[PDB]
């Protein structure tokens, strides 16, 4: 259940983000589930889930540049570069200590 729900959500996120109406541009060959009584239903679900993760992962990392977003969050929140916040405290030292 989790795999099905997350595969569908991830493909929906990809379509809504990159604007594609459907995945025609990729021209990939896909196999559909032939029947509910087929023996490879779990394998097909796993393959679809892996495809969805592959696409969404590459979107986030290559396209949306998530690795740099991690460094930006580190700097802004945990002061991995403390120069700016030091200037801020110095500039407003009298105010910050007031009630």
């Amino acid at each position: 259940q989790s795999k099905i729900l997350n595969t569908g959500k991830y493909l929906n996120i990809f379509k809504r983000c990159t604007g594609l109406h459907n995945f025609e541009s990729l021209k990939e060959k896909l196999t559909t589930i032939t029947s509910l009584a087929a023996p490879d239903l779990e394998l097909k679900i796993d393959e679809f889930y892996h495809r969805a993760n592959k696409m969404l992962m590459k979107l986030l990392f290559d396209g949306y540049n998530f690795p740099s977003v991690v460094n930006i969050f580190q700097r802004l929140f945990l002061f991995a570069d403390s120069f700016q916040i030091d200037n801020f405290i110095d500039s407003t030292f009298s105010e910050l200590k007031r009630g």
Partner: protein
Amino acid sequence: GETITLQVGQCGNQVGLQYWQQLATEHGIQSDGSSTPRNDHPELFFTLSDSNTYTPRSILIDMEPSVIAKSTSALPMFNPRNVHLWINGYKYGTEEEETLLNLIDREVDKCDNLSNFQLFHSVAGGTGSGVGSKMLEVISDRYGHKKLLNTFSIFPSVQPYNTILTLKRLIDYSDATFVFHNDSLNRIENGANKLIALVSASVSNPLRFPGYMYSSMESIVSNLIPTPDLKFLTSSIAPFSTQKHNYLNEYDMLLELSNDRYKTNRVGDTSYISMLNYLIGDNLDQREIRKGILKSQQRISFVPWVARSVLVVHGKKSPYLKNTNLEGIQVTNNTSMIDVFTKILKQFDLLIKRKAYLNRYYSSVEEENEVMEMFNESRESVKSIIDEYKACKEITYLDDD
């Protein structure tokens, strides 16, 4: 905040040339002030124009134009407008007080938020030492005590008189004075200005290459000066780097940085008042540093009344230096200052009982009385600091008995 560098005398100018060459190399600034292809902050030490040129904030002061000419020609990006050209030198400094006061006020106005004054000068520099001694007085008077001063004074290897006269004002007005001896520098080398330049450049590394902590000079200095009387610092440098047989781990850097042979001043048994170690490498293993800190705390003899804490800053190496191995600098506050000050006082007394060369300074009866009272005050101040450093060693320092 921004810092202003003051260079006084021939030795000061040469050391400053090496220092600025090192700093420009670290920030990739070319000799003409043009940039080279930001996360670092050279603005604290260089003025940036709206035409993309970096010029040093330093001010050059010397009695003769040959040294200044060499320094300016070697580094064309110096601003010529900042160039200006013992008792006789100090009286000469009184005459030029207005020009120098305005000259320094120009640099202070040019920066946005001043932090501290750096001073490169030699105590044994003769006339230049006199003009620098006057510089300290005028700066401290006009700017009050809100802005602190750091003096990288070079100690000496008739000289005793000059050393005492300069040390009186060095004690009175400086806020954090480094001590360097040419004897220990040439012993380490077994030119010499390249060690002082390296130490001074590394001391401010956390400011120019920001990290998680130690973003200001106040934090760096306050860890080493518990009392304004004990203001003299001993610096240690690890020389074994860039060779094949370098220190294999930062932990061995922490253990072997404490060797007495690497210290930049003559030392027997000493008690440490405060510690702070610089480690500068692209990547630093935390667990090695934790083990080294524990061993360093268990090995080093601190004075009883100090918190007994060892601080290690995790400096970041410059992108413009290609993948070089780890290097590190150690700055300490020891009670070893009593030995060198006692040596200076012994020389001064030996040469003051014998009226050897005082004729060059005593011009008349009023001059005799003036020089006598000045010398007595300087001697008393030096004895006072020796007694303070000696009372720090004992355990009854905080007792009112």
